[model samples]
Each structure stands twice: as structure tokens, then as C-alpha cells.
Target: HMWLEATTHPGLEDLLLEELSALYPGEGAEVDARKGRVRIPRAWVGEEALGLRLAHHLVLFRARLLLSREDPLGALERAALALPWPELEGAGSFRVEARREGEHPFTSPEVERRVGEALHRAYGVPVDLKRPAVRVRVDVRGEEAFLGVQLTERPLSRRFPKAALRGSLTPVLAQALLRLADARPGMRVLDPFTGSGTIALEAASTLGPTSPVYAGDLDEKRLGLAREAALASGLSWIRFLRADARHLPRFFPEVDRILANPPHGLKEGLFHLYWDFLRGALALLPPGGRVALLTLRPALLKRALPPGFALRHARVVEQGGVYPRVFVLEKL
Candidate 1:
């Protein structure tokens, strides 16, 4: 069996690994858990890796080799000649996407050029850098180079590009929050300050039809956008409301789990909202129920959490230059 590797948002490799194992159930899967990279041994066909909701890019893991620092590009050229270039036989055009970490004599383009030349020489295929039917993956780090073919032309994280909600959680990060909350089919899920309904949509998709999904925001414009997104996604069952997050218990009194990416703030206003939100969540959740939140304010959240809430998991993820923390708290 060959190996497959997928990339996720930094600080979320553990969740990505969880998603891959649950979705595919394969052996020899490993995660660095810090660089947002994970791998698993599998059969050659890999169309199913595109369905990985928490991943950005999926690569068919070809081989890993130690590079000779004296001549890294020469080492890469030798490795490229030995790889499965025959698999790239019928390509309209191909390009090598080379990435390097640590000190290296050759640049990424130099590596890309050499690898692309080798592949073209092997198969006499045309090369296109901007738009390639086949994109080769070459990652050189320190003394090692990992090679593969990127399976999906477009990144999986770009699936919900239509919803373009500024400052909203990404679909991948939203799914990570739900997974961290341990949301399940029978559970009732709620996103109290739902901005773009990203978390809600992930809930509807993961929990199947008929699972109760509720979302709310005080801003009707944002709430309407969330509603439109939910409808556009054919998830009309998700209840979108224009309600205050501080009053979540009044609307959904028996929620099993809450997953949300609430607003960020500079000072006391959002702090109070977070406090009241915790108060409402404390009332809404039953004992042992979970609430996962992503924010830049975990310290405030920790200070604001009501009694009987236990910290289940905590992690910080990076996206678009912002580092936000994800906290999973359980009602005890």
C-alpha cells in the first residue's frame, strides 16, 4: 500500500488526523500535529481524500529521501528520476510545486525547474506553471525531501468560497471546532453567535439529516447571510435566528453541544458578552455536554466560564495571519 498525506491549518493536525482516521480507517497514519501535516498508508486510488473536510491539500505520498546538503538539487534530480513519472503520462500539462524549509543552496523554483525538466524528459509531457493538469509536490526540509502528486486541482479548504464572510471562521476550522466538541448524530448542536453559519453547516453535514442545528446572531444582516448560506447549502433544517448570544438558553434550552467562533474585541464589551454567553451556555447545556469555541480571547473565556464547566481541550490554530485559540469546555 502507498501512503497519502494531507495538509491542514497549523495547530490542527491532531484534528485532521482524527478526521482522516474516522473517514478512511486506514493503517500507518501518522501526524506531526504541529505543522498541520498527516499521512496514512493506502491503496493507490485517492479520490476520496478530497472529501477530507479538515484538509487544505491532499498529496499521494510517493517517497521520502535524505538529501545530500552538498548538492541538494542534484539529490532531488536523482530522486525525481526514480519516482513514478509514468503515472503522469497523459497529462495536458504538468508543473512541479517545490517548497523548501531550512537552509538550502537551491531555491524552490530551481528545484521545481529541475524536477519539471526531469518529468518532461521521462514522459515528453508539456509543462505549464500557472495551470497544470498534473501538479507534482516536492517538499525539501533540512536534510529530507518528501515527494508526491497533489491529487486535487483546487484545495479542499476553498469549497465554500461563495460565503466570503470577513472575520468568520473557515469551514475547515469550523469543522475542527465541531469535532473537538465531539458532536454526534443524536446530539443537538448550536452556534450562538453564528456569523456565516460555517459551524452550523459543518454540523448538518456531519450529523446527517434530522439532527437539530440552531444558529443565531443579533445582527440581522449577518444572520440573513447565514440563512442564505444554509439554504444555499440545502441545509434548511438549520434554524437561523436573530437572537442575542447571551440568551441562547431561552431559545435552545436543551442543547447537547455548542460550537462557535465568536467575535474578537479590544476590551470590556466583548468580555461581558463572553461572560453572559458562558452563563447562558451553562444553563443551556446538560451535565457532560460540551461547548467548543474559537477566539483570540481564551484567557477572557477561561476567566468568564461559569461554575461546573471543565476544560476538555485547548488549541491554537493559525489562518490568514491570525492565531486563534480553540477551547472545548464540558459541563460538569
Candidate 2:
């Protein structure tokens, strides 16, 4: 009956909730987009938590409080001690992870120490900084602080766990973009500028085998990396090819959705690239078809947008250091 919070890339909280609802139907959920968190009535643990594409860390609900400057640590310690984590009863050891957002007298290091000391004394389990049987979570935002236990030992966004394509899109972001496009099996989804088959593979994996996923890149080296990754991931159904982004109609002819992550981080000017990409995308998609893009330069994309198309949805998501927007446009 307790609530659980699942964190995802900032700005994709609603999409994460959508994924949760789709994966576990009848599980009502709500989104706190500012925090990039999805709250549901029930907590998912073990393999179920790790299987999520959108959630990075799933924390079992414990306690939260509005902090006071007088004695914030005292308040945090009380919350942690009273927090119910029955699994720690027989646990070998544990670790404390603390984070804050707003001005606080305590630093993260000291916060972890304080919380760790309280948990160790209460559970009779020693602190294990190197490795922990379970991890405690303490996060402060504004004047409020939250307490919980992280169920995931590691982030669950390792869907495309490849280090080869450094410029490749995060699998989590790709999944979010697909959901925004409302991608489903049998939809003809194409990634005209797939750097390393990330969006293509995501479409193939999530849309099932019946979906047609096409991936292309002008650079053979990048496209080669994409091909290798698709092969390794066992998503062989993704059609890989070398094609110019400026002329996608010649390559794909027609597609229900165009999911792309153009080179926003590149140094050179790509306005022309963006312009021609939209021109080509406009041609390949039918009147009701949609184009989903993850870009840092939404202004450039808007300037290049052809007529007869309308912005359907848009949101900012944090990736590495840069913040990018995932926007969807529908052809009229």
C-alpha cells in the first residue's frame, strides 16, 4: 500500500510513468516532472525493477519531511531510524547515499556519515563503503528532505550497455522519445540519422518483431558501429543502411514515425542539415505521420520545420552534461 518513486532522466517523468503503466497495467501512477520522478502505489523490486527502460533507480518509499534549519541532521536521522526496511534485519552490511538540492549546513559526505551511523547502530550491521547489501537514500530538495532505500544495485538504463559509440543516444532517452511518438507494433519506425542504431534498436526491441525499424547514417564508420551494436543486441530486424539524411524519402519512401537524434553537440553549423532533414522527413511521412527528435537546438529545428506540420509535444531531458529537448511534430 506504500508508494514508490522511480527516477528517470529529467523531463521524462511522464513518459516513465507511461512505461510503468504499460508494463504493469492497473498500477496507477503520477509524475513529478520537475524531479523526474514517477510515484506509484506499489513498489517493484528485484528483476522487475531492473527490467525498466525508463527508470534509473527505483526506491522503496520510506519517509519524507520538510526540513528546518535548526537541526536538519537531527530530523534526517529520526526519519532514517524510523524508516521501515525489514530486509536490513538479516543484511550483512549497508551503505548510505546522500544528495541535496538547496542550501544546507551539512555536506553530502557528512550527511552520508550521519545517516550511515544511525542505520548501523539501529540494524546492528556494519557500514560497507566498498560494497553494501542494501543502500539507503537521502535526498534534499528545497526545504524538504526524502528518505528511502534504493532497490537497484545499479542503474537500470543499461539497455544499450555499449561503450563503442561515444556519441550514441542514451537508451533511456530513445525509449522516452518512442513513447512520445506512441510507437507500437506494426508502426513503420525509421531512424534517419541513427548514430549507432540506438533509436532503431529501441524501436525494434519495444515495438516487437512485427514492427518495421529502419536505421541509416551517411557516415559508414558510424553506421558500421550501429550495425555491430544491432548484431550484438540480437535486434537483427532493424534494417541498417547508409543514406543521406537530406533525402530520407529516397531511402525509406514512407514511414509511420521518424525518430531521430541529430548532431546537436557537433561544433559545425548544421542548420542546413536540420532544414533538409525536416524537408526529407516531411516527404516520407503521411499527413497523420509523426516525427520525433531529440535535439539541443529546438529553435533551429523550429526554423527548419516545414509548413503543414504542428508541434505535438516537447520536453527537456538531461543527458550527460547537456540538456536536450525531445519534441514530436505531426504532419497535417
Candidate 3:
């Protein structure tokens, strides 16, 4: 009925395809590495509701699922007649977007007109009119075409950012964090090696306007930059500090989640350095705490963690010839 677009790493379409299938199950999804996009069937849309409810209860605080729904007009009425959700009544304004897929032949005005007419009939306004609280997404895929009628409800940027650099956390990471951590409102989020404080900012933004965000880095310069960025991003609830990750909890208690992206590799005993940080963090975290970490060496992490900690999940993210593992660990 509708296509959901998501970001994916280049040359990893197969991995993304597997992940999409695992997550979306009965819904048919496609992963196109060349385009760096994952297309989700309409059926895969509502699963985020479960993801959100889970995040409302757990201690893991990495991914957050923000939901958005799209429906085609001719398709929507057909859908509305089949499905039931009346809470979307009395919306104020509407927006429309038309898209074409393929080299060129698919961009037909006739198809667009059909969708527009279908929308006008469904919403009862005008076939050639404008209104608020409604948004129409027009799609021309191959020879087949459809028009989805829905409203833009939440912040658009939460899905896929209008712009984001490689290695930066986006909606995918946010949702994963929420699902992995089971974050709840008011839970404190801490990122020890807070490069730009992106993860911390995301957690605070979702937790509430007043949720606490604790972020610090070994470098004073990065800490300063993070402070400025956090302030610019309406993150007044954040506490930025310059400290060593290996020696935290000097004056405070453990946090809800220890989400970290530790430095990779083993040159000059960097492995040991990271191990120290991991040990220190684990010691400070209480039982049932969660840590979502990214690293190049799983062996190092396995060797570093104390006895009794369990590995919840391990995702090997294959980057251009390099493989980094995202390990989700839980304190028993």
C-alpha cells in the first residue's frame, strides 16, 4: 500500500535485507544497496507501536521508534473501510507530494490526476482544493501506481534526517537504542565518550524536555563543542563535563544506560585502554543495566567483561572491508 524508506550502509544491501525481513516478518521489504535505501511494505509500519511500548519499560536506551503513517486516497478509503482508526478526525491542513520511480516513462500526468481525484473524494473537500491536516503521497512505481492519503503528524526529521553524515546516529540508531534499552521517560542517559553528544542529545530529546543527559569526553575541545551543540539543540537538561571514561562515578550514581562507541583497534595498547573504560563502566552500572557498544574487536570486549554479564545481541556491521560489531550487553 505504501513504501517506507530507510537508510542503510553501502554494499550491505543483503544484510539490510535480512534485517528488514527479520524485523518486518510477514511484510515484504526490499534493500537496495546502490540507492542506500530500504523499502518497507505498509504492513511493517505498525510494529513501531510495540517498539515504543517496550521502550516505555526497559533500561536499554539506544534506539527510539518514532511512528509515521501514510495512506493512499483511493487506497486509504479502501483501507479505512477495511481498517478502523477514527482518532484521525478533524485535522486542520493538508500537504501533497508527487513522486516518480524509474528512468522516465513512469511520470504520467494521467496517473497523478487519478490519485488527486481519488483523494478529493475520500476527504470530501475538493478535487481541486486545499485543506489542512491531510497530506497525500503520490507514487509512480513501475507501470503500477497509487496515491496514499495521510497527514504529517510528528516532526518529519525524526524518520530520516534531511541530512546526516556517515557514522552519525540517525533514526535507525535512535529506534535501535529505544528497542535495545527499553528506555522510559525521566531515565538518565549517559554517554562517556560523547563525541558530539549525538546519542545523549537524542535520548534527552525523546525522554522529555527535562530529562537528564550526562555526557563527557577525555578531550576538553570535544566536550566544549558538545556543550555548544547541545545548547543549540535545545538541550538544557544536559550536563557536559571533561573527564576520563575509565574513572567515572566520582560523585554520582550509575545511569540507566551506558551507550558508547569506543575507539577501535589495538595500536599502542588502545585495546587495554578501552578495556579499562569498559571495566570501570561495568563496575559503576547496577544489576539489570544495559550497555550498547560498538567496537572492532569482540575478543577484547569478551575478555574485558567480568563474569556473569550476558551478551544480548551482536550485530556485525560490515563497512568497506572493515567489520565492526555492535554488542548489546546486559548486567545480570
Candidate 4:
């Protein structure tokens, strides 16, 4: 089976599962996008959630191989020797992160060294360092050692580590959104309709400790929640402000990315507010600038985008059993 590992959110596992399933369009593939567990068919796996897509952050973990009902140590050694190790270029270093799930004995340094030597002999490279250019994690649990090679350098989300003072922008959606954004460290990121600052907090986790995150919202209560959430996530100096998304004229700096989940089934005031906000975002973001938005109404969102603004891509994600269209747009 494929492991569709999604970062857990306080109350949005069902939502994340629904959204992620849309990526694989077929039947008979059991999908469980639940809290602490996201199961998918093993063959369908890829780097689908590896890098940035639009505006959100992506978990930078490497590709993991889950071994089924068998002792993986021997197979791993053989794989090192037989598999096409030549494909590994620029993967200068890596480490064997071993975790034994219950009472299983830890693999000795001798065995680890043997495996490393085998890989070196095959791939002409060195053993993985603790901080590796490419890291392969080996997990042993209940007669299985799941191995995965990954290159992402950060956690799934900055805000996810702190689980209080917020909801709505759940971690599962946030993690997937981050992958979609494919953001880099030290880049400037924003969430104009920043509810509880989930998007900005997520950015802080995926982008580096030194990256700048700017967030703003109209509701004072939401902004307060965002502030507290940012603080709780150890982001002390987040540029969280109390401003309407529509009032971008007052803020004149260009941003590298924008993330928003506007109210879709709400009153007219929100629609009017988002209209201006969308226009402002489209104008502020330069060409190839990324944006990710979640909305219940697709037609209204399309109408909000200006004529010159081109749609990079868009996806319909169902969350918590409710479907919402997520837009990924860029300036012309």
C-alpha cells in the first residue's frame, strides 16, 4: 500500500484526506487521510508533495520506502548493490536515521556501516552525515523497516508544532499547500486574509528560521488569534498586522508568494472585500509570483481575477467532506 503521510491537524484530518484524494484519479486505491495516518496505494507514490506549488509551504522530507511483511535489512543491502545507484548525483552525503517501534533491537553500528559500505561501493559515494545533502531514513516497526530518501531540510509546518489558539487553516491543508508553493528559505511570504496566521506560521516552518512572514486580516479577534499562534510557534517577530485584505494600496512592497482562504458561503460583504483583495494581490505579485487560494465558489473567484491576470493552475479540494476550489494563479 502507498503511504499518503499527511501532517496532522487538530480537527481537519477528514478535510485533508478529501483534498489529497483528488490528486489520484482512480478507484480501488484505499485512501486514509486521517490524523496520524495517511494511507495510499504504494505504486501511486511520487514527488507529488515534495516541492512548492504556489503560495503555501511543503514538507521537505525525502522519499521513504515502506517494506511490507518481511525483514528489510537484507533487502536494503541488496538494493544498495543492485539498484541503479548511478542516479544519485550531487547526493553527496546522508545518514541512517533508525527508529525501532517497539522492542526491536537497534541495528548495530557494524551493520549500519556494512550497509553504508555497500551503498558506497555501488554508488561511489560516502555514508550519510547527520546533516546530509540527501538523507535516507530507515524505520523498523513490527517486522518491517520502511526506508525513505528525502532532501527537504525543515519540518512540515512551523505553526503545526504549536497546536493552540487556532483552527480553520488546519495543518494538513497547510502542509499540502506548502508543497504546492515550493517556497525557498529566506523568501518573503504573505497571507492577506490571514486567519489565525496559519499560512504565515506554516511558512516560517518550511522556509527557514530567518525567513520573513507577513500576515494581515480584517477581524481583530482572528488577528489576535494569529498573533498568539505565531508567538506560540516561536515566531516572535512575525509581521502580523491588522488590515483588510482589500486595502493593499497602503502596503506597497512586492511579495514572493500569497496564500488566502476567503469566505465562500458567507455574506456579500466578504465577497466585496475579497474582490478588492484579489485585484490587489494580482497587481502586487510580479510575473511568476505564486498564489494559492481556497474558496467554496469557483465562478465568483474567477470573476474576481482581472482580465490580464492569467491562471497558472487551480485545483478543487474537498475538505472535511466539503469540496472547495483552490486557485493557483500568477501575474501575466
Evaluate all candidate structures by whole-model CA lDDT and list the values in order. 0.81, 0.81, 0.56, 0.60
2 or 4: which has the higher TM-score?
2
Q: List the residue pairs that clash in candidate 2.
A: none
Cα lDDT for residue 40, candidate 3: 58
| Predicted candidate 2 versus true structure: per-residue lDDT over 5-37, tens digit per residue | 888887888778877787667746777767788
Please name the candidate that would achieve the greatest TM-score relative to the true structure. Answer: 1
Quote each prediction's TM-score.
Answer: 0.91, 0.87, 0.55, 0.54
Sort by TM-score, best first: 1, 2, 3, 4
Per-residue error (Å), model 1, residue 151: 0.6
lDDT per residue as tens, model 3, 203-318: 77677764566877777766666677667767767887876777777633578777776755424477667767777777767898788777777887787776656888876654
**Candidate 4 vs. true structure, TM-score:** 0.54
How well is each residue in 1-332 modelled by candidate 1, as lDDT tens digits?
35788888899988788878987785687887568899888767546667889998888857788898677788888887877765576676999999988888789999999888988888888898788889898998788888878887777877545455545467788788888888889788888877766778778877887689988887778777777777777888988887888777667758999887777752788888888888898888889989988888778888888878988888889977788888889999
| Candidate 2: residue 300 Cα off by (Å) | 2.0
TM-score of 3: 0.55
Clash counts per candidate, in order, are: 0, 0, 24, 25
Better of 2 and 3 by TM-score: 2
Worst 10 residues of 3 by lDDT: 53-62
Worst 10 residues of 2 by lDDT: 160-169
